[PDB]
Amino acid sequence: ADLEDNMETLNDNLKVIEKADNAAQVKDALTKMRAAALDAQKATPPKLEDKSPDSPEMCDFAAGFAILVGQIDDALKLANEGKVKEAQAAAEQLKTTCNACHQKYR
């Protein structure tokens, strides 16, 4: 799918997680987020459309999703262990990465 749709998924499932009642819900939402981060990792954002795929900017962009997915995995680990509150905490930490990239390239 496309960037906007991916970012919607990221955003919706982040809310789902803040409101979550059980670990399956969280798991499920993180899994969806993961699939979206990996998709967005392939995209070229409007801001960077004139830039070489090679460029420091494009690499930085993709790296942000590498970090995001990494963190999502840490959150998934906790959710699989059924630590709901800790997984919710972890997902809140995601936001700094969302923001960091948004400032540069959104």
Ligand X SMILES: CC(=O)Nc1cc2cccnc2c2ncccc12
> Does 95 carry a binding-site annotation?
no
For residue 14, state whether it binds ligand HEM (rule: CB under 6 A). yes
Q: Is 45 annotated as a binding residue?
A: no
Closer Cβ to ligand X, 36 or 61, answer by number: 61
- Of 61, 91, 63, 98, whose CA–CA distance to 76 is shortest? 91
Query: Is the Cβ–Cβ distance between 23 and 55 less than 8 Å?
Result: no
- Give 1 or 59: the residue with its C-beta nearer to ligand X: 59
* 16 binds ligand X per the rule CB under 6 A: no
Per-residue mark of binding to ligand HEM, 34-63 (x: CB under 6 A) = -----------xx--------------x--
Q: Are 30 and 72 in contact (CB under 8 A)?
A: yes
The letter for the amino acid at 49 is E
| Rounded Cα distance, 28 and 58, in Å | 30
* Dihedral sign (CA 33, 106, 95, 71): positive
Residues that bind ligand HEM (CB under 6 A): 3-4, 7-8, 10-11, 14, 45-46, 61, 64-65, 68, 94, 97-98, 101-102, 105-106
